[PDB]
Scaffold this active site. Structure first.
Site, PDB file in Angstrom:
ATOM      1  N   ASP A 110       2.162   3.504  12.306  1.00 24.12           N
ATOM      2  CA  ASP A 110       2.456   2.064  12.274  1.00 24.12           C
ATOM      3  C   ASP A 110       3.976   1.835  12.167  1.00 24.12           C
ATOM      4  O   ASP A 110       4.644   2.562  11.445  1.00 24.12           O
ATOM      5  CB  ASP A 110       1.718   1.401  11.117  1.00 24.12           C
ATOM      6  CG  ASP A 110       1.554  -0.106  11.321  1.00 24.12           C
ATOM      7  OD1 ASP A 110       1.029  -0.819  10.432  1.00 24.12           O
ATOM      8  OD2 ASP A 110       1.963  -0.580  12.393  1.00 24.12           O
ATOM      9  N   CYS A 133      -4.139  -2.868  17.908  1.00 27.97           N
ATOM     10  CA  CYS A 133      -3.778  -1.869  16.904  1.00 27.97           C
ATOM     11  C   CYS A 133      -4.210  -2.497  15.568  1.00 27.97           C
ATOM     12  O   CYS A 133      -5.374  -2.838  15.419  1.00 27.97           O
ATOM     13  CB  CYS A 133      -2.264  -1.609  16.921  1.00 27.97           C
ATOM     14  SG  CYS A 133      -1.295  -3.129  17.279  1.00 27.97           S
ATOM     15  N   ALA A 163      -2.125  -5.172  13.540  1.00 28.42           N
ATOM     16  CA  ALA A 163      -1.827  -6.583  13.715  1.00 28.42           C
ATOM     17  C   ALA A 163      -1.965  -7.027  15.169  1.00 28.42           C
ATOM     18  O   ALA A 163      -2.061  -8.231  15.431  1.00 28.42           O
ATOM     19  CB  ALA A 163      -0.445  -6.879  13.216  1.00 28.42           C
ATOM     20  N   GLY A 164      -1.981  -6.079  16.107  1.00 23.59           N
ATOM     21  CA  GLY A 164      -2.031  -6.424  17.521  1.00 23.59           C
ATOM     22  C   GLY A 164      -0.699  -6.904  18.105  1.00 23.59           C
ATOM     23  O   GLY A 164      -0.648  -7.781  18.966  1.00 23.59           O
ATOM     24  N   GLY A 221       2.800  -4.722  17.523  1.00 24.25           N
ATOM     25  CA  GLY A 221       3.798  -3.645  17.647  1.00 24.25           C
ATOM     26  C   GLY A 221       3.379  -2.544  18.632  1.00 24.25           C
ATOM     27  O   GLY A 221       3.946  -2.370  19.732  1.00 24.25           O
ATOM     28  N   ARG A 222       2.359  -1.806  18.226  1.00 25.76           N
ATOM     29  CA  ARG A 222       1.837  -0.724  19.045  1.00 25.76           C
ATOM     30  C   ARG A 222       1.113  -1.296  20.268  1.00 25.76           C
ATOM     31  O   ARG A 222       1.287  -0.778  21.388  1.00 25.76           O
ATOM     32  CB  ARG A 222       1.008   0.276  18.202  1.00 25.76           C
ATOM     33  CG  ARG A 222       1.855   0.901  17.075  1.00 25.76           C
ATOM     34  CD  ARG A 222       1.025   1.694  16.027  1.00 25.76           C
ATOM     35  NE  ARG A 222       0.358   0.783  15.103  1.00 25.76           N
ATOM     36  CZ  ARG A 222      -0.486   1.167  14.149  1.00 25.76           C
ATOM     37  NH1 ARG A 222      -0.756   2.466  14.008  1.00 25.76           N
ATOM     38  NH2 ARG A 222      -1.073   0.251  13.369  1.00 25.76           N
ATOM     39  N   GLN A 267       7.435  -4.404  18.056  1.00 29.61           N
ATOM     40  CA  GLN A 267       7.561  -5.111  16.781  1.00 29.61           C
ATOM     41  C   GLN A 267       8.766  -4.585  16.014  1.00 29.61           C
ATOM     42  O   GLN A 267       9.292  -5.255  15.135  1.00 29.61           O
ATOM     43  CB  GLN A 267       6.235  -5.096  15.987  1.00 29.61           C
ATOM     44  CG  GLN A 267       6.270  -5.682  14.540  1.00 29.61           C
ATOM     45  CD  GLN A 267       6.564  -4.606  13.505  1.00 29.61           C
ATOM     46  OE1 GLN A 267       6.053  -3.482  13.615  1.00 29.61           O
ATOM     47  NE2 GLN A 267       7.385  -4.926  12.501  1.00 29.61           N
TER      48      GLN A 267
HETATM   49  C1  LIG Z   1       6.372  -5.745   8.933  1.00 27.77           C
HETATM   50  N1  LIG Z   1       4.993  -6.153   8.667  1.00 27.77           N
HETATM   51  C2  LIG Z   1       4.345  -7.297   8.919  1.00 27.77           C
HETATM   52  O1  LIG Z   1       4.775  -8.283   9.493  1.00 27.77           O
HETATM   53  C3  LIG Z   1       2.919  -7.329   8.491  1.00 27.77           C
HETATM   54  C4  LIG Z   1       2.075  -7.587   9.737  1.00 27.77           C
HETATM   55  C5  LIG Z   1       2.011  -6.369  10.643  1.00 27.77           C
HETATM   56  C6  LIG Z   1       2.720  -6.430  11.836  1.00 27.77           C
HETATM   57  C7  LIG Z   1       2.685  -5.339  12.682  1.00 27.77           C
HETATM   58  C8  LIG Z   1       1.966  -4.192  12.401  1.00 27.77           C
HETATM   59  N2  LIG Z   1       1.986  -3.148  13.291  1.00 27.77           N
HETATM   60  S1  LIG Z   1       0.954  -3.084  14.536  1.00 27.77           S
HETATM   61  O2  LIG Z   1       1.147  -4.357  15.242  1.00 27.77           O
HETATM   62  O3  LIG Z   1       1.315  -1.914  15.381  1.00 27.77           O
HETATM   63  O4  LIG Z   1      -0.428  -2.943  14.044  1.00 27.77           O
HETATM   64  C9  LIG Z   1       1.273  -4.154  11.189  1.00 27.77           C
HETATM   65  C10 LIG Z   1       1.280  -5.233  10.297  1.00 27.77           C
HETATM   66  N3  LIG Z   1       2.658  -8.445   7.618  1.00 27.77           N
HETATM   67  C11 LIG Z   1       2.416  -8.302   6.310  1.00 27.77           C
HETATM   68  O5  LIG Z   1       2.392  -7.218   5.743  1.00 27.77           O
HETATM   69  C12 LIG Z   1       2.195  -9.589   5.555  1.00 27.77           C
HETATM   70  C13 LIG Z   1       3.426 -10.070   4.787  1.00 27.77           C
HETATM   71  C14 LIG Z   1       4.712 -10.186   5.566  1.00 27.77           C
HETATM   72  C15 LIG Z   1       5.445  -9.041   5.855  1.00 27.77           C
HETATM   73  C16 LIG Z   1       6.634  -9.109   6.570  1.00 27.77           C
HETATM   74  C17 LIG Z   1       7.096 -10.350   7.004  1.00 27.77           C
HETATM   75  O6  LIG Z   1       8.259 -10.418   7.686  1.00 27.77           O
HETATM   76  C18 LIG Z   1       6.350 -11.496   6.711  1.00 27.77           C
HETATM   77  C19 LIG Z   1       5.161 -11.429   5.998  1.00 27.77           C
HETATM   78  N4  LIG Z   1       1.221  -9.489   4.494  1.00 27.77           N
HETATM   79  C20 LIG Z   1      -0.032  -9.901   4.574  1.00 27.77           C
HETATM   80  O7  LIG Z   1      -0.464 -10.416   5.581  1.00 27.77           O
HETATM   81  O8  LIG Z   1      -0.862  -9.730   3.380  1.00 27.77           O
HETATM   82  C21 LIG Z   1      -2.256 -10.003   3.293  1.00 27.77           C
HETATM   83  C22 LIG Z   1      -2.970  -8.973   4.160  1.00 27.77           C
HETATM   84  C23 LIG Z   1      -2.686  -9.799   1.841  1.00 27.77           C
HETATM   85  C24 LIG Z   1      -2.486 -11.456   3.738  1.00 27.77           C
END
Ligand SMILES: CNC(=O)[C@H](Cc1ccc(NS(=O)(=O)O)cc1)NC(=O)[C@H](Cc1ccc(O)cc1)NC(=O)OC(C)(C)C
Ligand SMILES: [Mg+2]
Length: 280
Positions: free
Chosen positions: A180, A214, A216-217, A219-220, A258
């Protein structure tokens, strides 16, 4: 601004310059993508009632591109148009225990026959995605729909599954080594998976959209689909437009590609393809 096309015989040098002085021009170009697509409402995704249906509260589909089930129509899923016709892809978050039936409903309703999954279910001690398909060969109800696994083929870097639903067949491409927020271990690997999926798609006459997800749908999933588009550009044109591919994706969902390192990875993929062809 919206695209940055690079003649293929200039690509090697252009990427060197992007990387100079600590990725200075590369980070600057990547940053210009920040607000793309963001002029658009997420108002339905933000309703109180749909809150439990979103894996992450910052990762929400646009009203104008969301997939609707046919606020009971809600799923966290966005259509991505292709260069020639709408809905080339449906991009979605990893389904949740309470949305795994909505996922398969969507699959059924939208005539999906191919699913790509570029996440693992558990990563670094956290659940990233429900194991939303059958763990074995016995048929299983997902609400209204019956799923049954007909085959499971584990390959070195991805597993291919085939399911019957009702009655239709679905192929599921699970890429098993993509950390991730990061990138696959080599360019070769993901270039080969992407080419592999594209080949299956191109023989799958009259499917719906291809599903990619992936966790969050964004990045990957975004990097996968950007690489798809870019590899097809390289087989069609004598210029390559990584920036414009990522830009196109952002217009339709937040955060596609992402992190910066995933952006660098797309350039390294291109660099490696073009190096090989050079003396061929
Ligand atoms: C950097 N991370 C994030 O933005 C992730 C969402 C996310 C995005 C992309 C990916 N990678 S993926 O797309 O490859 O799956 C995983 C998770 N979001 C959270 O962890 C968010 C908080 C957040 C983080 C960073 C930000 O700038 C704003 C808010 N947390 C969150 O949603 O917590 C719950 C599950 C309890 C509701
Ligand atoms: Mg159930």
């Amino acid at each position: 601004k919206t695209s940055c096309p690079i003649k293929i015989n200039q690509f090697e040098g252009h990427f060197m310059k992007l990387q100079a002085d600590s990725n200075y021009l590369l980070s600057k170009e990547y940053e210009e993508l920040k607000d793309v697509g963001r002029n658009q409402s997420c108002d339905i995704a933000l309703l109180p009632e749909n809150r439990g249906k979103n894996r992450y509260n910052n990762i929400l589909p646009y009203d104008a591109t969301r997939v609707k089930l046919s606020c009971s129509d809600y799923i966290n899923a966005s259509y991505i148009p292709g260069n020639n016709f709408r809905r080339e892809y449906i991009v979605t978050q990893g389904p949740l225990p309470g949305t795994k039936d909505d996922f398969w409903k969507m699959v059924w309703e939208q005539n999906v026959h191919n699913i790509v999954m570029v996440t693992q279910c558990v990563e670094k001690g956290r659940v990233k995605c429900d194991h939303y398909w059958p763990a074995d060969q016995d048929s299983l109800y997902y609400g209204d729909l019956i799923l049954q696994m007909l085959s499971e083929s584990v390959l070195p870097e991805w597993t291919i599954r085939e399911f019957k639903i009702c009655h239709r067949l679905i192929r599921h491409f699970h890429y098993t080594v993509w950390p991730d927020h990061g990138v696959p271990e080599t360019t070769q690997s993901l270039i080969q998976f992407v080419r592999t999926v594209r080949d299956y798609i191109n023989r799958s006459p009259g499917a719906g959209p291809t599903v990619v997800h992936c966790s969050a749908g964004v990045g990957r999933t975004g990097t996968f689909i950007a690489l798809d588009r870019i590899l097809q550009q390289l087989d069609s044109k004598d210029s390559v437009d990584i920036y414009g591919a990522v830009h196109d994706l952002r217009l339709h969902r937040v955060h596609m590609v992402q992190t910066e390192c995933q952006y660098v990875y797309l350039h390294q993929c291109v660099r490696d393809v073009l190096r090989a062809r050079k003396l061929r």
